Design goal:
Chains B, D: Keywords: ATP-binding, Iron, Iron-sulfur, Metal-binding, Molybdenum, Nitrogen fixation, Nucleotide-binding, Oxidoreductase. The complex is a heterotetramer, with 2 copies of chain A (522 residues) and 2 copies of chain B (477 residues). Chain A contains 21 helices and 12 strands. Chain A is an alpha/beta fold. A 5-stranded parallel beta sheet of chain A has the order 10-9-8-11-12, sandwiched between helices. In chain A, strands 3-2-4 form a 3-stranded parallel beta sheet, with helices on both faces. Chain A has a 3-stranded parallel beta sheet with strand order 6-5-7. In chain A, α8 crosses α10. In chain B, α9 packs parallel to α12. The relative contact order of chain B is 0.13. The chains are: A alpha/beta (522), B alpha/beta (477). Chains in contact: A-B, A-C, A-D, B-C, C-D. The complex binds FE(8)-S(7) cluster (2 copies), calcium ion (2 copies), magnesium ion (2 copies) and hydrosulfuric acid (2 copies). One calcium ion binds next to α16 of chain A.
């Protein structure tokens, strides 16, 4: 039933007695359900050290991964170029998923095409799909560039992108001068961040490899910036703002911040902003190239060093106080620009906030996950705040990256109780937050199911989620936030200490029980 | 818009395309004539998508894992292949269920074999057998496993049927191999058919020799309701108030046992014809169970459906039918009294999958709204035959619409509201056109039944009449 | 007892059995406490309509006010002037409280002096205290200006500030030319915002009354901006940023954003930034003066119109979409600067966020309180969001303000269930949130006690607090936020929709009970 | 440095002041000589503040309402006068209690008569009488009312004593008039004394001839512990483990009945001498109850205090004393073993109100720290007499320190930590000096007793050794 003045959606409609009785009858009559005592016994077992030991012995099964596949990263990279259409050679189901996954995180349109290879292409491959697909995409969507990646069926059949694109131009499907950079992006190698690196290196090769003779390092007096796979708008914006405040000439190579934030003014803009073709063509004339997320830009690094002859600096992601400091000092050295009064003062305002909030942060224990550069920067900042990052999970991490994070932990007393896990998933992390319970998780929306599981054990065992990472689907507009630079560190600090204080308020809200500590002032 | 203006709009839009694409897309766009009963005279459907044109379609794995198998709550569904497909489809579809997730139910979890290069080069069958043993250890209350194939499995020549048979015999377990690789077919649709045949071949016959079920004359199954936001529960309640006994729900909130009990029912009630007609025809063939199409969108359709279903039973069910209709009369009449004056005359364009593009028209008309364009991602001509009598004369029909077409049709027709999916939503809102998600219900619903109609009406009104829509034009422009 | 490797503070130390038993023995032995059944009975009665009617009949008793006293506002106004020391003539207890109150909100130093009048001054007045106080303050703290307000004992005794300051100069305690603007700020008239208006008009009079004959309206090509009592740093910053982006010349008159946000860099800065004496002397030469918070700047308005001959525009506070648009169109008219592409795009990004979030905001019911301009702007923006502002409380509101808010409510279908309350306090508001329960409160930290009370009746009755206003003492760094302009609207929208989704996640977290609606995607 | 360097630091700082201020301030600043037992030979105290110099002091209302009366949990305390004073003092002081707030306990609420101009002009006594009736209607479980006068009340000639007498008789209610207007005295100190006299005159004698209460030989009261962060509860537990019966706590978590029962105890245990010596001397005069000073900061002082208290009773209490000391020995020894190596040799400057500037020194010394400077807002010379023996030779003492002085002293002495209040905290943090609030405990505590020492040590370590302190200098500067 409904009352027209106060309509109930699924919650709380299905708590009405008639619905509850109906669902009891469904269960008892037809579901042959395990008895509640058996469900409770199994649940309790899944919280134990014995279960954790079996869980960590898995070799074949993955449960609740914390990574995605290469072409998702190729798409995001392509979206950062002016009037560029991401094009994925292969199976169309993939593109529906890529678009939807980004749609839900950015709450924006996400433009991407397929060339709709089907079973028939296994005999002969996808050459015709590339010909008609490039012609059709250019005519219909009027991009100035089509950036080509692959799905797994195209990789397994062995389609030669370079030959197929060259034949499309040879046979008149698209103009010879029309740019069609490409990258092979197999989903069974690496992760989405590997797709970003592959795509970027392909675009860089397209515009520079055959035009190197007239280049002179430093001649344009700029610094190239390569952001990597980045899903916070504020992270593109803070880097541009800091370099502009410092009077540093720069080119941000792959910059989707406009196309992921168009205004709602009565028109749809398929394309907006982005790195220009002239910027990519000119990039070898820069002083140097800085990689913001070096642990997924290794192929780009080899190209930039080997072909552009840039001496890419050994810099960590600019997260937290020390690594933002190091980024600005190295940019100052390269550019010759001093660090301005404005950024010195912003730094000091972050340090002020640290001094103001250190008593509530001290000793707090975190489980956290995400991509390798993000993770290592979050670990570093947590150590700077006097926090303990006790469960560090990077599903798509590697042994070299782990050694680097272990060295960061070893150098801080706040790292004594921390362990780094690579190749492990959110079902592994669920065990750790039961067996060695931290105060909070910092992670993406998939963490809400771990919080749900921990509450089921009891309120005292609940581990609240703090949403920082990708994807975030269950809150609105967090993609506008910043994690880089002093601004990012200020936002992170504020989110962490207020998550602590909101939980303490919950735990002290009980009238005549715990509200002796329900302080007005904290 | 006249028939002649709609025909002119189709030709104008098609001018952008190269000749091969233009000739193809012309066949997939039509101006409704409600007298036609052979839609194969006016529209082509269920063909390949043209490369490069930004189809909205998904793949067979979406149709099998995402749609049919994934909702079954007490089984573990393995996304078998590389990591993408299971991650993008993890908890994106709101196929609601009652259970203890990670313990007896598994719907919003992503189980995967996470193929690496070694698995592609040397095969995934050894990895699959080991994965099954790991599942049994760590998830002992699972009541069966399905293997949802992604693109590489058939391309590399793995034999998941052999692994399923050998492991199923070893563990005395239902293990269901599903060949729903995304390279098969043209859309989600073939995934439905593959999935239905896998239920037939590996699950449905288990109780064929068993006589222990206590049957009644009033036993039915709900076939093709995936319980989006609780849609199947707000349907079930009415069937059971009418005196029927709903043995099974395929597959929203569905259990493997209720699937296995379905051959024991008197009547299969088919909501989603596209996805479940296959197994409904099988059940009639093998078990003699009749099936019938019904529609629980809005009061007009819901009342017509309850009466048609009750007519299959005896006077006692026909009497209870009229008591259910009398109970809910004042509730839906109050919804119409409040919301119809807020929506009367407003025009809607829809674009959805295989059912909803025709099935929700009645509910819009119960609020005085007009559906002026509709179409489907992956419908076949039998769906279009059903659509042409539901749609008004001279309305626009589009099969496998391109992103370009949908934008240009909307620009000319200027609907008051658009109902489509997540890849469409944010485009149209920027254009100043109110948008409602008609897959996920925009995180609302249920929309089925009388209780769903109230929520549907609330939702169309909140969005169409929202104060945000007057604010897109800056006052200095 | 304590375990050294997990030390317990008050929470949860006092939940140990020995402490619980000790507290039970203290109660039973010595407190003569009302029986728990009687406490429960009286609690339940305080939630009823019968209790609410008696509560609303109060004439003499105030409980849990939502206002403070005039000199607090005078101090905040004074802080916004370059190298200016706020000075409160009267009793020193008042100054320790003003400084502490602001210390706790900004987490910054707050500099203010007293002249330490004692009971002895009741015979003879506080003239000597003014003489020695000005001399001592100038010598010790080297301000460039001392801005004088009063405490209530100085007002009751009747000290003539003008005469006392004049005599301090005449007798040589401070140089004639040293600026000592003043204002009478009686705590028994109006509220803290009245103190701000009085202090500001006194400073404006000091620098302009006697020098009008050389002024020409419009001759400096700038617009004066008067912010009023403002405790979000982001509000001073956003107004300056928007006028700068438009190329509009402006003078922000009272600008404490630097002194309330100094860096922690190893030195204490008593003064930083602020409105210059020259800006105030030159202010009559502006094109016009815009009042950002007109409902507490009425005395300022009379002086600016009467003496400077500025045609102050009839503008609401620039909060929400319509009133930010109106502000910018009026600034465009006055300055002759078009509204720039950057602000047009920011506006459309706000409208995008409204489109994206409208389904969760629609129909949501709020109780709210604060100062009059802040409250009316929050009400307006809530109506633009499709929300219902059902309990609108402004303790320091007046009848003319109420009539204005009532007219805004009457013009929207979202105002149908709303009531505006003036002169009522947070004990009145507590009754309303029991008798006519809203979804959330939007208020300051004193709202936490109402949330506590509602939870005690039961989880289903709990009304969560969303902290927007002043003071906010129990969360860190929220004073950095913004509520004005499109940026403030974006921040308020994001806070509201994520508060809604956080609560829905809490209500749907119950395993096999409500988690059917625990969606990954919202 | 030595007495030489500290005297010349004093003289250099005082160079900024005009002559009258310089001459006054010189008398309030001293270099400790621990052999002096007459501090009136080396420092002046409890005098007016010099105008314009940024005293840290509050007023008599703070000392009465804020400190003594406000914690009494089952009374309603009216801040009588205009709205400011009650609002700034609402829930600022962490005087913890157990109760049902708004129902039987009222501590964190702000009750006020919100004076307007008509109340100043024509008087507030009619408003006060009406306010009392409104309190009785809306807060029926209140056990008594106090009237905390703000500045205007005595200035306008209101008669709150007459209102309290007339309404108290009408309603059979304890209604306490308190003349704690902030124009009285020079600081919080006179508000203590005024408050003590109002307890004496209107509450403490109520049960003088009432012998209903069953006394034991082990009955004590905790006098002058306001239970900051639960400090009185972590003190009470030890006194009662030692076999004593704590009849009353003045006034942290205090009830009006426990105050009225206090004249039945055998011994008053005074923690805060400054605020409660007055009523302790009264109780010895009138009832013959002895009193003694004790100190529960840190293990050395808590052990000495327990033994000294137990010596006033019999062998059974002295035996239980040694059992308590044996029980907590391994706990406080573990705290020292962990924290003292982390803090040894670190130097602290303090500035607090009337007790803690001497009382916490032992607890610092238990962690190997040195208190190199201390001072008080509002102490009298009997406090300075007690301080000179607790502080080291040649340390700095400051009475009613100015903001300028404190900053200048800190810049020369360069302590490793400062312990002071909220108006001081953010200044010193910007200078890169670790700071702990020694009024509010920085929202931590308790600090009293064995359990409090653990938290004290944790807190001084977490702040002094925080990683933030190494980060104030930008590496390019
Ligand atoms: S049609 Fe899968 S998303 Fe793709 S590149 Fe392979 S891992 Fe990544 Fe359908 S079954 Fe899946 S979703 Fe595509 S791959 Fe095929
Ligand atoms: S010494 Fe009160 S804060 Fe003041 S101007 Fe009057 S309302 Fe406002 Fe002490 S008793 Fe109080 S706090 Fe001062 S006034 Fe006196
Ligand atoms: Ca958007
Ligand atoms: Ca600060
Ligand atoms: Mg905590
Ligand atoms: Mg405990
Ligand atoms: S899940
Ligand atoms: S409270």
């Amino acid at each position: 039933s409904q009352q027209v003045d106060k309509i109930k959606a699924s919650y709380p409609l299905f708590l009405d007695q008639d619905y509850k009785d109906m669902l009891a009858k469904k269960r008892d009559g037809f579901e042959e359900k395990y008895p509640q005592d058996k469900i409770d016994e199994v649940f309790q077992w899944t919280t134990t050290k014995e279960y954790q030991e079996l869980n960590f012995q898995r070799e074949a099964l993955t449960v609740n991964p914390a990574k995605a596949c290469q072409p998702l990263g190729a798409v995001l990279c392509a979206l950062g170029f002016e009037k560029t259409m991401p094009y994925v050679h292969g199976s169309q189901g993939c593109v529906a998923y890529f678009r939807s996954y980004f749609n839900r995180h950015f709450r924006e349109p996400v433009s991407c095409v397929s060339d709709s290879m089907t079973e028939d292409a296994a005999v002969f491959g996808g050459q015709q799909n590339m010909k008609d697909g490039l012609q059709n995409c250019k005519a219909t969507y009027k991009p100035d560039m089509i950036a080509v990646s692959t799905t797994c069926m195209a990789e397994v059949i062995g389609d030669d992108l370079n030959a197929f694109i060259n034949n499309s131009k040879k046979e008149g499907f698209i103009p010879d001068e029309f740019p069609v950079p490409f990258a092979h992006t197999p989903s069974f190698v690496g992760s989405h961040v590997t797709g970003w690196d592959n795509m970027f290196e392909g675009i860089a090769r397209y515009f520079t490899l055959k035009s190197m003779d007239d280049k002179v390092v430093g001649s344009n007096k700029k610094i190239n910036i390569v952001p990597g796979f980045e899903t916070y708008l504020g992270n593109f914006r803070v880097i541009k703002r800091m370099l502009s405040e410092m009077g540093v000439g720069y080119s941000l190579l792959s910059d989707p911040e406009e196309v992921l934030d168009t205004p709602a003014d009565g028109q749809f803009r398929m394309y907006a902003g982005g790195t220009t073709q002239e910027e990519m063509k000119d990039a070898p004339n820069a002083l140097n190239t800085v990689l913001l997320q070096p642990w997924h830009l290794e192929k780009t690094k080899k190209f930039v060093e080997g072909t552009w002859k840039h001496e890419v600096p050994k810099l960590n992601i600019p997260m937290g106080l020390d690594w933002t400091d190091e980024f600005l000092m190295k940019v100052s050295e390269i550019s010759g620009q001093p660090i301005p009064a404005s950024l010195t003062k912003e730094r000091g305002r972050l340090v002020d906030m640290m001094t103001d909030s250190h008593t509530w942060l001290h000793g707090k224990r975190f489980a956290l996950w995400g991509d390798p550069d993000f993770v290592m920067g979050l670990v570093k900042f947590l150590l700077e705040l006097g926090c303990e990052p006790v469960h560090i999970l990077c599903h798509n991490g590697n042994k070299r990256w782990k050694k680097a994070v272990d060295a960061i932990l070893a150098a801080s007393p706040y790292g004594k109780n921390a362990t780094v896990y690579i190749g492990k998933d959110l079902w592994h992390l669920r065990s750790l937050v039961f067996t060695d319970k931290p105060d909070f998780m910092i992670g993406n929306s998939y963490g809400k199911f771990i919080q749900r599981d921990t509450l089921h054990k009891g309120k005292e065992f609940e581990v609240p989620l703090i949403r920082i990472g990708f994807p975030i689907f269950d809150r609105h507009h967090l993609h506008r936030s910043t994690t880089l630079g002093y601004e990012g560190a200020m936002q992170i600090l504020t989110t962490l200490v207020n998550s602590i204080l909101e939980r303490l308020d919950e735990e002290t809200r009980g009238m005549q029980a715990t509200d002796y500590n329900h302080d007005l002032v904290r | 818009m006249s028939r002649e203006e709609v025909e002119s709009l189709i030709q104008e839009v098609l001018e952008v395309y190269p000749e091969k694409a233009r000739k193809d897309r012309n066949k997939h766009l039509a101006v409704n004539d409600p007298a036609v009963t052979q839609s194969k005279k006016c529209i082509i459907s269920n063909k390949k998508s043209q490369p490069g044109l930004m189809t909205i379609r998904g793949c067979a794995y979406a149709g099998s894992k995402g749609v049919v198998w994934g909702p079954i709550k007490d089984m573990i569904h393995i996304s078998h292949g590389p990591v993408g497909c299971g991650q993008y489809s993890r908890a994106g579809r709101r196929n609601y269920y009652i259970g203890t997730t990670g313990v007896n139910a598994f719907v919003t979890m992503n189980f995967t074999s996470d193929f690496q290069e070694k698995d592609i080069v040397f095969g995934g069958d050894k990895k699959l057998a080991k994965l099954i043993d790991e599942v049994e250890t760590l998830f002992p209350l699972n009541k069966g496993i399905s293997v949802q194939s992604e693109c590489p499995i058939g391309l590399i020549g793995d034999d998941i049927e052999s692994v399923s048979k050998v492991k199923g015999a070893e563990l005395s377990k239902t293990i269901v191999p599903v060949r729903c690789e995304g390279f098969r077919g043209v859309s989600q649709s073939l995934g439905h058919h593959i999935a239905n045949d896998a239920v037939r071949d590996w699950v449905l016959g288990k109780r064929d020799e068993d006589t222990t079920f206590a049957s009644t004359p009033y036993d039915v199954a709900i076939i093709g309701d995936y319980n989006i936001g609780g849609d199947a529960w707000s349907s079930r309640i009415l069937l059971e108030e009418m005196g029927l006994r709903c043995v099974a729900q395929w597959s929203g909130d569905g259990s493997i046992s209720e699937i296995e009990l379905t051959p024991k029912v008197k009547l299969n009630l088919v909501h989603c014809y596209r996805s479940m007609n296959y197994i409904s025809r099988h059940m009639e063939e093998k078990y003699g169970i009749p099936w019938m199409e019904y529609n629980f969108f809005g009061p007009t359709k819901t009342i017509e459906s309850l009466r048609a279903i009750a007519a299959k039973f005896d006077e006692s069910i026909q009497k209870k039918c009229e008591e259910v209709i009398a109970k809910y009369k004042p509730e839906w009449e109050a919804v119409v009294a409040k919301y119809r004056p807020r929506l009367e005359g407003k025009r809607v364009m829809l674009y959805i999958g295989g059912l909803r593009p025709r099935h929700v028209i009645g509910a819009y008309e119960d609020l005085g709204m007009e559906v002026v364009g509709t179409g489907y991602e992956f419908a076949h001509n039998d769906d279009y035959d059903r659509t042409m009598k539901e749609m008004g004369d001279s309305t626009l029909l589009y099969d496998d619409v391109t992103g370009y077409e949908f934008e240009e049709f909307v620009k000319r027709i200027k609907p008051d509201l658009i109902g489509s999916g997540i890849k469409e939503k944010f485009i149209f809102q920027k254009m100043g056109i109110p948008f409602r998600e008609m897959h996920s219900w925009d995180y609302s619903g249920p929309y089925h039944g009388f209780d769903g109609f109230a929520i549907f009406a609330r939702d169309m009104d909140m969005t169409l009449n929202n104060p945000c829509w007057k604010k897109l034009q800056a006052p200095w422009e």
